[PDB]
């Protein structure tokens, strides 16, 4: 879950109330290498849904 | 064999902060003792390593 | 990632998995905290030409509701037609 | 100067796990009890 | 639906949902009052409040409805009108893959019939509305605030309850216990008066008067 | 145009009984309260209290709200009788940190501009 | 689509019920769980040594309010208010005369810390890049006062903060 | 664009804690298996309504 | 500048000074007034005026998209330096 | 009809070993109850029409797989527990008597919005 608040804060600035998605779309672009990193997240993290 | 390269690595650590009396300062003031390397120093005397 | 090679084999054989191809600690996969800059695109509104604003004004399309009925043979109808049956999943039906 | 946008590789991403994988382990009931039993035998003696 | 700013338009939904309002009204002349269909797609109904029991139970139970969820109850203040509250029923159907609306209408002192016996849900909707608005519901299992403090006087969603009340709390060392006392503020709330001068939607213009 | 839904009662007098039997089971419920509640005060200061409730609103004569008043009341009774209350709630009735407030022209002209 | 989480049916032959019955009395699946729990105890920890070791940030984090200015040391702001006006908490209070030499100025800018949500949304509003929400988390006070900023406050913030905020600005302003 | 991803809805049985537990835990999975294909199948161009 | 009232307390750049008889002076009893010593009104008088060839200039303030919004300033009184309404920088028209 | 299901699937929803029986009870039921309803009520029209539809579709296909499908109203459990719903409401329409004219129309501005 930490690591996702990284996400966050990384298109928004805020790790919680991030008030990115607004009416119309969302306030800014995704920061450049976010997906790489959403992906590496991605994919480790079945395993430890195995381990719980 | 692995046990001991560990152990080398746990006493380079006591002379890379420049002693016993090193290392324990930084034992005590930052619960860490590891060993790294010196990106610059600042005005106020802060190290970043 | 500092592990000894015992240590992998120990917590490997505990869990049951290679737990060191999928560490939960990030180490040099991350991308660099300093990007290039960026060039974001423009939108399809951004022309010089034939871009009136009253041909894309979407709020002024909308229309007051209509009014079906007000107190001022047939056949039977449903709100919708009928939902349609779901189908089991062909990845793995049962878990 | 080209657009430059977050976007994914042009291959695009390796494949990602999301089933279950429990795997499968241990020894035979049979052979689990007869150990048990034996450790009881030899004890016993 | 080649417009990249444009909500696209659903004809097929229009002409169904609309046909289905001529349903209601068709089979249930003594309560309903009006039906209309939204721009977007959205069937509401609006009936006599002598006909909830009735109207939502039909909707529930008939086959070409079976609306067995409701999604949500709730009501709105509306002074202008002599019948100031508004009850609007949200409702969905699983069978049909719809969503309707049921609204009525009520005023300070008149009571509405409770939707318990016919959704189970509606207990505490209910509840809420009361300690919001102050619309009396009858024959309710228990009807008690539910959201409002314990010995709280008014019912803050209408629109002549003041948004920061009529009281605060804070705690007392003489008496050793919280205390309410009348609301002073050090910053008021500011009032912005934000509405243009200038019209912006004109197919709504109501009639001159 | 005058024909209007009951709440509960269909005249005045059928509501006025319903008052009535509302202040008996304030009456019973007072000494009770400050014993479960443990307050300071006595009980004919509670059951004063209560009467200056009533009378408040002493001048109603629309059936249903006195119905409404009677509703409101008895939500009141069941939070004091099952100490959904607490003792804060109890004794916020009684104003007790609320210093007096001037109530004759000259004093209210010496401290500001209010009616 | 959909699966079926638990509608299973186990096997009745001998072998798997004898398996289930050992399961049962010794407690197979049980002892499993308790290894998870030994790799995780020689698993490196997820610890960070604050305040030593800091958390990661990006140059979009909204901290710590800072009035900025120009090159010249001149103010930027120029009394808009349209912070004020988009504060969705009203935490903004602003006051603004004509300066000596007749430029548009703030006599009062105060920032309310415990009324703010730190959204952001002043910092988007502004026309002039005067507002920033800055890196700065650690500005725990302890008392209430020392939480209701006025100008003062915010410019030695901006005069503090600069270079930080400046080089985030650079590195966002094209996503904004 | 939830029409345009793949994924099955976890369904319980028994109508029990345990049920919903497994069905959270594999909703976890499934988006997971969208998380993969949004990762893939993002589009370029704007992000809010070019309607200012 | 920071000029100090004869009770000994800083002044602001809005002037603001608490006089000998105000009692909400006492706040500052053991703690401090805090008064930023760069006035922002002698520092841009310190900037020197921008010698231009035209009677129109544009002002972006610096930075481009990091500046102010653009603004165009007339040149053509010569009893005046024009002035721009964002960043107060000052120009002036060579005399060709 | 084929095996019976172990399970519909729904909790709380038992299997029925007579499906076709039971629906014809159920509708021929309904058939008798909308008699009472006045002839030219829209209630009696419109219900009788969709039950006769699904009377006929019960008699026609015997397996019960098949007659799912073609009665588009999920496992023929779902179906008989909807033909009771109906029923029971057939018995209150009768009391309710919606067929009958607007009791009252609503006050003048009482729909219009924008206010
Ligand atoms: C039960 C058996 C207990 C004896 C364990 C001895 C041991 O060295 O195990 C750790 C050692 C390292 O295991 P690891 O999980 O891979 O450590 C992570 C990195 O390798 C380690 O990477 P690293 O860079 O951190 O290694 C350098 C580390 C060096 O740390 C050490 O040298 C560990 C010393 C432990 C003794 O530096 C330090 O932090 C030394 C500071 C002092 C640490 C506290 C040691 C207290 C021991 C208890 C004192 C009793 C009095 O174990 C092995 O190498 C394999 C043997 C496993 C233990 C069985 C022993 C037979
Ligand atoms: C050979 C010559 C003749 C002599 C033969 C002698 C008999 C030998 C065969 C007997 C087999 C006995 C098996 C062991 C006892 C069974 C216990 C039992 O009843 O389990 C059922 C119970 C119940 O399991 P359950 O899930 O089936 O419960 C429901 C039971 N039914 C369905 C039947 C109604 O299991 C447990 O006891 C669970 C305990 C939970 C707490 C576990 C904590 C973790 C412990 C892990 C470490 C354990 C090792 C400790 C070692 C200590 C070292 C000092
Ligand atoms: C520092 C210390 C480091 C060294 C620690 C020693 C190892 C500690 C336990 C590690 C746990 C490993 C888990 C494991 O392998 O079990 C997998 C397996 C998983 O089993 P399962 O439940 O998943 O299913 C497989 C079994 N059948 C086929 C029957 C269904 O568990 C076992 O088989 C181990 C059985 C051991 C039983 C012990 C209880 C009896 C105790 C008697 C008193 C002594
Ligand atoms: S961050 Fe948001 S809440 Fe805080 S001052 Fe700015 S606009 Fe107001
Ligand atoms: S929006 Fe910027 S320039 Fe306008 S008043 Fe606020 S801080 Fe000053
Ligand atoms: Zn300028």
Redesign the pocket.
């Known amino acids: 879950r930490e690591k996702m608040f990284e996400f966050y804060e990384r298109v928004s600035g805020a790790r919680m109330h991030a008030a990115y998605v607004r009416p119309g779309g969302v306030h800014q672009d995704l920061p450049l290498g976010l997906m790489d990193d959403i992906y590496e997240f991605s994919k480790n993290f079945s395993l430890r849904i195995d381990e719980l | 064999m692995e046990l001991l390269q560990v152990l080398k690595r746990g006493l380079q650590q006591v002379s890379g902060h420049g002693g016993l009396r090193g290392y324990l300062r930084v034992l005590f003031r930052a619960n860490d003792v590891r060993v790294g390397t010196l990106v610059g120093e600042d005005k106020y005397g802060n190290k970043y390593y | 990632a500092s592990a000894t090679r015992f240590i992998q084999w120990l917590r490997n054989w ?1 869990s049951g998995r290679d737990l060191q191809a999928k560490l939960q600690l990030r180490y040099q996969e991350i991308s660099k905290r300093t990007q290039p800059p960026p060039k974001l695109p423009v939108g399809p509104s951004h022309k010089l030409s034939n871009n009136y604003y009253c041909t894309r004004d979407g709020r002024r399309e909308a229309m007051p509701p209509s009014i079906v009925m007000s107190s001022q043979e047939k056949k039977a109808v449903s709100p919708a037609p009928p939902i349609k049956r779901w189908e089991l999943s062909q990845d793995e039906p049962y878990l | 100067s080209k657009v430059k946008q977050d976007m994914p590789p042009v291959g695009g991403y390796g494949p990602i796990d999301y089933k279950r994988n429990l795997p499968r ?5 049979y052979s ?1 009890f007869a150990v048990g039993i034996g450790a009881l035998l030899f004890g016993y003696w | 639906d080649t417009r990249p700013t444009v909500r696209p338009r659903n004809d097929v939904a229009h002409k169904q949902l609309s046909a289905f309002g001529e349903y209601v009204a068709e089979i249930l002349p003594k309560y309903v009052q009006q039906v209309q269909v939204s721009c977007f797609n959205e069937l509401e109904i609006c009936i006599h409040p002598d006909g909830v029991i009735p109207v939502l139970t039909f909707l529930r139970d008939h086959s070409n409805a079976q609306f067995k969820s409701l999604a949500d109850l709730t009501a709105v203040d509306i002074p202008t009108r002599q019948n100031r509250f508004e009850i609007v029923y949200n409702l969905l159907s699983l069978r049909f893959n719809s969503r309707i609306r049921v609204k009525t209408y009520t005023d300070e002192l008149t009571p509405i019939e409770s939707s318990v016996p016919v959704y189970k849900a509606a207990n505490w909707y209910e509840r809420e509305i009361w300690d919001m608005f102050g619309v009396f519901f009858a024959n309710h299992p228990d009807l008690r605030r539910i959201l409002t403090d314990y010995g709280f006087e008014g019912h803050p969603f209408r629109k002549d309850f003041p948004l920061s009340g009529y009281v605060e709390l804070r705690y007392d060392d003489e008496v050793k216990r919280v205390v309410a006392e009348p609301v002073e503020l050090a910053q008021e709330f500011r009032k912005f008066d934000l509405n243009s001068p200038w019209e912006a939607f004109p197919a709504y213009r109501q009639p001159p008067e | 145009s005058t024909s209007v839904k009951p709440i509960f009662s269909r005249d005045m007098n059928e509501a006025k009984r319903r008052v009535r039997e509302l202040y008996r089971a304030w009456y019973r419920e007072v000494p009770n309260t400050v014993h479960l509640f443990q307050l300071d005060i006595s009980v004919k200061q509670g059951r004063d209290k209560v009467r200056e409730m009533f009378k408040k609103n002493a001048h109603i004569t629309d059936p249903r709200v006195v119905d409404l008043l009677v509703i409101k009341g008895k939500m009141e009774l069941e939070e004091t009788i099952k100490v959904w209350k607490q003792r804060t709630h109890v004794m916020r009735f009684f104003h007790e940190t609320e210093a007096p407030r001037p109530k004759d022209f000259l004093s209210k002209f010496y401290v500001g501009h209010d009616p | 689509t959909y699966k079926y989480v638990n509608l299973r049916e186990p096997s009745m032959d001998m072998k798997s019920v004898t ?1 289930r019955a ?2 049962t009395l ?4 049980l ?2 769980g ?2 998870m729990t ?1 790799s995780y105890l020689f698993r490196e920890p997820a610890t960070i040594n604050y305040p030593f070791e800091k958390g990661p940030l990006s140059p979009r984090f909204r901290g710590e309010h800072a009035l900025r200015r120009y090159p010249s040391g001149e103010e930027r702001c120029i009394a808009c208010k349209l912070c004020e006006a988009v504060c969705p908490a009203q935490a903004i209070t602003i006051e603004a005369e004509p300066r000596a030499d007749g430029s548009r100025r703030t006599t009062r800018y105060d920032i309310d810390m415990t009324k703010c949500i730190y959204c952001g949304f002043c910092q988007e509003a502004c026309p002039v890049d005067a507002i920033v929400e800055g890196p700065n988390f650690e500005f725990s006070t302890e008392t209430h006062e020392e939480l209701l900023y006025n100008k003062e406050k915010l410019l030695n913030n901006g005069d503090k903060w600069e270079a930080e905020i400046a080089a985030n600005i650079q590195a966002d302003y094209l996503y904004r | 664009v939830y029409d345009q991803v793949e994924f099955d809805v976890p369904i319980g049985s028994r109508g029990d804690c345990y049920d919903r537990y497994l069905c959270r835990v594999e909703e976890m999975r499934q988006s997971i298996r969208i998380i993969s294909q949004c990762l893939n199948k993002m589009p370029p161009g704007e992000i809010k309504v070019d309607d200012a | 500048g920071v000029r100090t009232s004869p009770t000994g307390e800083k002044v602001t750049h809005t002037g603001q000074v608490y006089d000998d008889g105000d009692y909400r002076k006492v706040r500052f009893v053991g703690r401090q007034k805090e008064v930023n010593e760069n006035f922002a009104i002698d520092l841009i008088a310190e900037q020197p005026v921008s010698q231009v060839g035209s009677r129109v200039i544009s002002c972006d303030g610096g930075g481009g998209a990091l500046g102010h919004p653009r603004v165009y300033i007339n040149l053509d009184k010569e009893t005046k330096t024009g002035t721009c309404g964002y960043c107060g920088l000052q120009f002036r028209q060579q005399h060709h | 009809a084929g095996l019976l299901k172990k399970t519909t699937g729904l909790v709380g929803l038992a299997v029925c070993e007579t499906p076709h029986e039971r629906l014809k009870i159920l509708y021929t039921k309904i058939l008798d109850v909308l008699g009472h309803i006045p002839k030219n009520a829209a209630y009696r029209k419109y219900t009788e029409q969709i039950t006769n539809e699904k009377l006929s579709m019960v008699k026609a296909e015997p397996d019960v797989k098949k007659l799912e499908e073609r009665l588009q109203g999920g496992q023929i459990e779902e179906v008989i527990l909807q033909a009771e719903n109906e029923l029971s409401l057939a018995r209150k329409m009768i009391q309710w008597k919606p067929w009958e004219p607007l009791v009252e129309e609503p006050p003048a501005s009482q729909w219009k919005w924008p206010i």
């Open positions: 505990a | 382990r241990g020894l035979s009931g689990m | 398996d050992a399961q010794l407690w197979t699946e002892i499993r308790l290894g030994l």
